[PDB]
Amino acid sequence: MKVNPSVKPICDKCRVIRRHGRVMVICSDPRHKQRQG
Amino acid sequence: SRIGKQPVPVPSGVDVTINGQNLSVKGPKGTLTLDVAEPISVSRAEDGAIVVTRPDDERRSRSLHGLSRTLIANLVTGVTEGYTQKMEIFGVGYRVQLKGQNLEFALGYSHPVLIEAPEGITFAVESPTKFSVSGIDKQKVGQISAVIRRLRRPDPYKGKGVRYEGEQIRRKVGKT
Amino acid sequence: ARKGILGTKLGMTQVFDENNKVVPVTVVKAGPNVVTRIRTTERDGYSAVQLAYGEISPRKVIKPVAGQFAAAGVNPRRHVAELRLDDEAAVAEYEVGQELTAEIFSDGAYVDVTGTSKGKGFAGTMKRHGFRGQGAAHGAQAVHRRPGSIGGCATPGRVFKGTRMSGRMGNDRVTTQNLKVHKVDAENGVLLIKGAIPGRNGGLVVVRSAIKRG
Amino acid sequence: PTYTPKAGDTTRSWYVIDASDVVLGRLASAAATLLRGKHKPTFTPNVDGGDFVIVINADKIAVSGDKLTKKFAYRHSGYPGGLRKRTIGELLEKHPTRVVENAIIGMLPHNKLGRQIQKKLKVYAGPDHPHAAQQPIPFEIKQVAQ
RNA sequence: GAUAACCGCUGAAAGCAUCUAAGCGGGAAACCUCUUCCAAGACCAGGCUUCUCACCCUCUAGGAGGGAUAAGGCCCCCCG
RNA sequence: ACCUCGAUGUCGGCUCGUCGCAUCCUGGGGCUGGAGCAGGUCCCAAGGGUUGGGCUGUUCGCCCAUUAAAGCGGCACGCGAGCUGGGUUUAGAACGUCGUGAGACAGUUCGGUCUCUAUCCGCCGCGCGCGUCAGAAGCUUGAGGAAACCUGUCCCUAGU
Ligand SMILES: [Mg+2]
Ligand SMILES: [Mg+2]
Ligand SMILES: [Mg+2]
Ligand SMILES: [Mg+2]
Ligand SMILES: [Mg+2]
Ligand SMILES: [Mg+2]
Ligand SMILES: [Mg+2]
Ligand SMILES: [Mg+2]
Ligand SMILES: [Mg+2]
Ligand SMILES: [Mg+2]
Ligand SMILES: [Mg+2]
Ligand SMILES: [Mg+2]
Ligand SMILES: [Mg+2]
Ligand SMILES: [Mg+2]
Ligand SMILES: [Mg+2]
Ligand SMILES: [Mg+2]
Ligand SMILES: [Mg+2]
Ligand SMILES: [Mg+2]
Ligand SMILES: [Mg+2]
Ligand SMILES: [Mg+2]
Ligand SMILES: [Mg+2]
Ligand SMILES: [Mg+2]
Ligand SMILES: [Mg+2]
Ligand SMILES: [Mg+2]
Ligand SMILES: [Mg+2]
Ligand SMILES: [Mg+2]
Ligand SMILES: [Mg+2]
Ligand SMILES: [Mg+2]
Ligand SMILES: [Mg+2]
Ligand SMILES: [Mg+2]
Ligand SMILES: [Mg+2]
Ligand SMILES: [Mg+2]
Ligand SMILES: [Mg+2]
Ligand SMILES: [Zn+2]
């Protein structure tokens, strides 16, 4: 899971949310899990 | 929104009780109680429904509308038909048995593990590989099911562990 | 419940177990204690038992202490302490007047022994704090046993309360814990504990059950 | 000239303030007001001539926003690294009273007279107090319109 | 016990979906109890209890001042 | 070139620490081009721990035997009214080089005085006085603090 200042939907199965004050991108692919920090 | 805009069916055998913003549902399987949100309104439509209505379209009430609607629906269905979860095991030597009302897992640890079914939940093994968990509460059944599910690390190589019934695990193979 | 008793440290010697291994023992006279008072939450705010040990002449007892013993109904003793209990069901079995001896303990029982350690006078940082000294040769000038630096320059500009310096040492409450009771001489009112006990000979110790190994 | 109190000029009144579902800052500011004596026309900044204040139900104080988890009370023990922090949350069920009184102490003057003034504050976490003998008249948190 | 990262449950807004938005959980040598020691000059100076619980004089009768005592202690003495 | 030239002592080592976390070990995880063993990377985590020698004035650094690991930093590049004095920076002498010379060299070599009875704050201990609405004594509650916290190997589980 990346923790980077910029998170983007790498693939079309990814989708961006705000959970507990953080922008996250969540996909069915575990490699694409990614959040801001 | 639209889901929060339609009332919940109540069957001819299930009786409801409304007091203040609190309510309860009683049916063949058991009884349940629930509390309804503040800005939302809950009404007994005597023509056979419970109507959940938002006074306005502010985002808070717009949000709590469907939430409260689904809470009432889950309450009623849980008291009428109950909530059951089928859940399977995979691997050689990964086995399931019972002990009193508790359900015991032997999943390749150097010690056995066993889970005590908490209140309103009854475990029921139907095969050393296949077992089910049932209850009057949708949230409790799901939570204890998830607790069972995560007694092993995910296995993308052999798949061994506790899987749900209808779940298709992802699996990647190491080169050896 | 956490049992305990007051006694004196007689001395220490050695014994050989059945498997023929020498065991250093401190010998404690866990002589008779009368319980003189009960402390209860309903009245005092906590549950504890006040018990008295020793032999003392009534001529040497001050009138308030003699009166506090008369209200109990027991002859005065030299030392008075109390056991902190935990609940009221623990103090249900203590009644003002009754007795307790070394037979409260047994073989293999782990006990915590509280004593007061020996006085070491005004001690320096090497004895007191295990400081490394400084060189005995190679030019060291009159600093062979001194602490040296006690802070930093101008920031913070002070010496950080808690700095380890030299002063009075010893004479402190010390609890040595998980000490095995090798053997209770029941008839002679003695008990033999494997290990060392704080204090001088003929000093008051409190031998309690162990909480870590009970 | 201007009135200054003589020896037997100060009279003390006993106020009980209920703290159930009241804002902590509002309650503390009012209690500081009628603890210092700012409501008396005979006020004089030299003299400690306020009133006694009992705060009842200091448990039920209301703290707005999200301060029950991210607001802290810091103490320092004087030793290097001797700083400890307790949230408003922990402080409300460890022992609650000081929370309320903490606020009031921060709005009294930090001088010797403020130390004398503090002694008139009686905070109780329960709904009842032992001072029924002084007939404490209930006090309502009122605002004067303009 | 409460949590960090992390893992979730039930779930709208947004007919499907999502650990969150309403609510409910798991979660570390870090934090809070826990173990040890100091601790009421903690000025909110605490609690339980025992002992003594008395005897005169002056100034001018309002308060103060002086003195002899109790319970107790201190010094002197023999020591550690 | 802002304070200090009617004086703010300059490197390294010793003693004693103290704080940060930008984590070296130990603890919790997500992703792997992660089968296991062992890793890579990122995230959380500062409680404790973090060796002895050879070479060198050494810091740095090179190496030797270990270790769970041999972390990086701030504090007047912490610490000389606490130590040292190998380095550097007087005066002696010599080499090389420059200079006609006197002499000079971010060139080298050998030698070369490290003062102070602690006033105040600070800190480590120890008493005397008054206070806690009479005077005393025994036992105590604890708000609030301080201390401590490290870790390996072997064997069963399982040659699973
Ligand atoms: Mg990128
Ligand atoms: Mg030495
Ligand atoms: Mg000298
Ligand atoms: Mg010498
Ligand atoms: Mg200096
Ligand atoms: Mg300073
Ligand atoms: Mg849904
Ligand atoms: Mg969703
Ligand atoms: Mg203090
Ligand atoms: Mg007292
Ligand atoms: Mg006396
Ligand atoms: Mg200029
Ligand atoms: Mg200047
Ligand atoms: Mg200068
Ligand atoms: Mg000068
Ligand atoms: Mg000077
Ligand atoms: Mg000067
Ligand atoms: Mg230092
Ligand atoms: Mg970090
Ligand atoms: Mg770290
Ligand atoms: Mg790790
Ligand atoms: Mg990893
Ligand atoms: Mg800790
Ligand atoms: Mg050398
Ligand atoms: Mg350092
Ligand atoms: Mg320096
Ligand atoms: Mg430094
Ligand atoms: Mg120096
Ligand atoms: Mg010097
Ligand atoms: Mg030299
Ligand atoms: Mg010369
Ligand atoms: Mg020439
Ligand atoms: Mg405490
Ligand atoms: Zn994706």
UniProtKB/Swiss-Prot annotation, chain A:
Any GO BP annotation: translation
PANTHER family given in the database record: 50S RIBOSOMAL PROTEIN L36, CHLOROPLASTIC, LARGE RIBOSOMAL SUBUNIT PROTEIN BL36C
Family: Belongs to the bacterial ribosomal protein bL36 family.
Gene name per UniProt: rpmJ
Pfam families, sorted: Ribosomal_L36 (PF00444)
Protein name: Large ribosomal subunit protein bL36
Record keywords, A-Z: Ribonucleoprotein, Ribosomal protein
Gene Ontology CC: cytoplasm; ribonucleoprotein complex; ribosome
InterPro entries referenced in this protein's UniProt entry, alphabetically: Ribosomal_bL36 (IPR000473), Ribosomal_bL36_sp (IPR035977)
GO terms assigned for molecular function: structural constituent of ribosome
